Amino acid sequence: DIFERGSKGSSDFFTGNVWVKMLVTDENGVFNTQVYDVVFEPGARTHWHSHPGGQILIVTRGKGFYQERGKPARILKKGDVVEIPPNVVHWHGAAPDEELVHIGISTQVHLGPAEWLGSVTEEEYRKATEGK
Template identity: 55%
Template sequence: MKNILISTLIFMTLLIAACNTEKKPTETTQQNESVFPKGEKLDSENFTGTVWLQMMGARDTALHASFGNVTFAPKARTNWHSHPGGQLLFITSGKGYYQAKGEPARPLSAGDVVEIPRNVVHWHGAAPDSEFAHIAVSLNVDEGGAVWIGPVTNEEYVSIK
């Protein structure tokens, strides 16, 4: 199991490194450019605002992990939730936030990595003025999927400093 987790982490690190290649001065860059597909628009009560999801990788659970590209429109965010097996976030574009319950929100931008321990109640999403994208890796999915708790209120969201 530990070897599978290490292999997954190495793969994701290489994937992020490949995304952070420097552009030549003659190339133009769009703010929302990504090497990953944006995916399908989600219709879920577990998110506030417009969010797209593109699941990636095999559908079986041989790795005990699932991962996908999640893109948030400005102000969009997850509800408060936790993961029995933990979660990793690899930020690929834009500006956003991660907040564990009872802690201050942490600003995020491309290249940041968030390690979320098992069963930590948290949320993540876009800043008010930026689209935001990350690769979300749910670990040890054989222990269960996300546990959804409730929305991040507008008051909680706008109070981020």
């Protein structure tokens, strides 16, 4: 609705079909902040990862999940704002039944890039999402 779909996200960092559109790439480092828009098709999600800088998600459409490692998953819908603290290992993605669209803001980009870990397994995903 607000933005066109971006380009297909790498299978190295995503499970399923995800489209990413860079809004602010901050190539010159002026803002120390990057901004992206992402569409997760049903079932699609990031791998587990963390950022040294805090991340902010703003949900613009659909239904999805955010989960920090060892913690219960949080249900996302339009309007929700997720503050992802620095270094917290987490994933986010769509509900099984419905796409998720959100803006993402990476803060304190200079602290370093995302650290990518393992995929969110089918088991982890079902456990987090089944019947919610």
